[PDB]
Design a protein around this motif. Sequence first.
Motif: not given
Lengths: 436, 436
Positions: B236-246, B288-292, B315-318, B427-431
């Motif tokens: 039930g959290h569509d839109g409040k949660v993003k994805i991060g990849l390593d 296609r996916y909410p990757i941030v 997007i943020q690149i680590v 929040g949305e300002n994590f970067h």
Amino acid sequence: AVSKVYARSVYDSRGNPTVEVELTTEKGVFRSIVPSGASTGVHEALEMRDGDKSKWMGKGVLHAVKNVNDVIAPAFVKANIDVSDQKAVDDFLISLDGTANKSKLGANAILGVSLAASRAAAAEKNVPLYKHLADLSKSKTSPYVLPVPFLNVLNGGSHAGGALALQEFMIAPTGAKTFAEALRIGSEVYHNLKSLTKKRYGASAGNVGDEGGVAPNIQTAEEALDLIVDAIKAAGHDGKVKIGLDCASSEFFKDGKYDLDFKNPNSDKSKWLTGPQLADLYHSLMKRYPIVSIEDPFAEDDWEAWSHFFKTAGIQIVADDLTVTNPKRIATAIEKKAADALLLKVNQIGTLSESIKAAQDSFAAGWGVMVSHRSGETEDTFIADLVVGLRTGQIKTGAPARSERLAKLNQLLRIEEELGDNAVFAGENFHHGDKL
Amino acid sequence: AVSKVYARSVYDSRGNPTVEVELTTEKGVFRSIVPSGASTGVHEALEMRDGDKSKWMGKGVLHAVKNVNDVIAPAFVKANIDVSDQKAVDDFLISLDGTANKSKLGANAILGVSLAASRAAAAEKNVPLYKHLADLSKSKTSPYVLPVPFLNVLNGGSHAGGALALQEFMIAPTGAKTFAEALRIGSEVYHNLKSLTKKRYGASAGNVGDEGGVAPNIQTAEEALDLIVDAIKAAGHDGKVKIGLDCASSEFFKDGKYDLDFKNPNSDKSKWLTGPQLADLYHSLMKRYPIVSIEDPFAEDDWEAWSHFFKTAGIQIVADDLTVTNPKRIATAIEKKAADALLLKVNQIGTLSESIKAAQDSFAAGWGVMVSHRSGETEDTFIADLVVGLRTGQIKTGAPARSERLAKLNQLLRIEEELGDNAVFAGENFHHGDKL
Ligand SMILES: O=C(O)[C@@H](CO)OP(=O)(O)O
Ligand SMILES: O=C(O)[C@@H](CO)OP(=O)(O)O
Ligand SMILES: [Ca+2]
Ligand SMILES: [Ca+2]
């Protein structure tokens, strides 16, 4: 004197909320974190769960937290209780609840305060927690007994895919001369075991269960047992390491019989075993492998199967689901000569006082006591000082993996180092560590 | 004043030995536990391993411990250093070692003392560790910034069977209004994900990797991504949660190309990708996916592929293996505009002073900073106060499972509660949490 009592919601090692309590006295803030328990329990102290499916899958502890903050705290502060008097603390808590299973305020609400107070009492006394626990339980102090850790290495039953019905395989390094050595050996065994698992069952087989052991798709008990023996051998520790089993047999007891292929799900019922046939299978495993301890060999109400088995077992037999740290159940178990060791879970009874008494009554009957962790553990190291305080000589606190497990083992490493010549490692004498 | 410095061998969350340091001053005993690092490292601070195959699989830290007890301790006590002066502590430590990578005394020996001193300094100052860390790093204090936790949920690559080459999938609850809320949501997502995994891949699929995420046999990135999206949806959290990849792409970089089926092991080389083809695959997943956030999209020395990609990433690149918390590498990364976020690992550099400086230089270039855990973590919660002290707005400290992970998250829960109105959730300002 206690000036404040506060509770907050924190997370256990499975990602479920649990209660954390902070108690303030003139000596500082003392904290305790409660392990997850049962919110539904015949014969056991009930932990309180919110039940709101919209928050944490219905596992919140907000009510529990309120109980501490809004009910206990104020009553507790006003009572002016001396924390050094654990029983007065616990009697107060119990009297506030008013139920036999702490289902009014919740066992989670009550345990948190009960353990924090013991930390406040030791601080007040200027002694390490284990010495204060030794004083409360009237345990011998010269020397102190460091326990043989019963490390989870491999899981079956309801905790794995595969056909294996036995739930947990532990290794107990009884041949080491110190806690530090026992821990080093157990870890090497464990790492060899993880190597063998990955080699034989796939990369996947190496992931861990809740308590840190592997859980590969295994078919039989002999298959699991041979793997473990290979690991001990590969580590170079043949003879210094024994095996412990947790059968969790209540899980495959159906119709007066035991289904060893309960995951079936076309289990051949002609193959179900009676208590006596089951006992013959255990005797067979006991002759081929270095098993020194068997927990819950028979179902929780199968009194006659335990007794029968107890007569020729010859190894330590641990009561877990049979007794659920319940005094009336313990007394029964003793009376029927069903086993000779109690799995002690402080949150199954709800207060430190009642946990210490359950162990004393066990000790008085000549039983051994294995202090146990819970499935959902925390970073709290309480059971490490408790096992030393109770002088039980044996603890079950998981595999040498996952810090909710290592936090305890790390703490035993510090206690040992601190005691110097005043500590002995229970070794081969773990069953009666209390009498060493 | 510091009267004693002592080290002992304790265990990390993987069952390998690590160093624990205890520092005594007139205010008490301050402890630190170091995470496992690299004993072999070009560009990174080297941790010291015993190498004796007969003890702990050659992973002992007895030398490291001796270095602390026999070399540092005495020099340290006699130096009469003021712990409040972190740089003087760290300069002393470094000067004692005399090498660029702390390979004389060991980064594990040195870090333990460096962090304990900071605990001793805060105590001395009468402030919580995060306030002292804020003072050392000259961070804004009104308000304090609580971070978006980047929770590991699913692992691939070298950490799983299956064909999936990408190493870690994280969820970041950027849409929550508080740390407490973000954590509740992340846990519900995680639990739904564990349900779906077990349902689709088997009982086995539910066991966890070192950092607490699942590691089922998955074939493709889309397969992993769709599972995660299903879990967020089910929670039930569509839109409040993003994805991060390593991506940990250094692991499948071979011959100037990238093998997405590197586990093959009959990988069709005609299918290997150049930096640019790889970038096109990332762009496709990003649409296609909410990757941030994407960590290590390209190999550790593939400078041109990072730059190119950086130009249109959006997007943020680590930078993790590209920079290994190494200042000369960071400066290069900045100069080449290769990414805009540094994965900070205090034990990859060896002292708190150098960790804080690496973050400052990042902040000065407009980069974000993600404080990170290590594979082998402990019950020590240091990085929780550090992330708040540095005001980074983002931490990577594992899944909501295994207490070496939760210890940190639990600590952030306490800090938040303690700050009251003086804390904001990135929040949305994590970067750019630093600039909030
Ligand atoms: O001892 C334990 O940790 C387990 C099983 O032996 O009990 P529970 O899952 O109920 O906590
Ligand atoms: O961030 C981490 O925890 C891992 C990978 O991202 O690093 P390492 O395994 O080297 O500790
Ligand atoms: Ca059990
Ligand atoms: Ca990485």
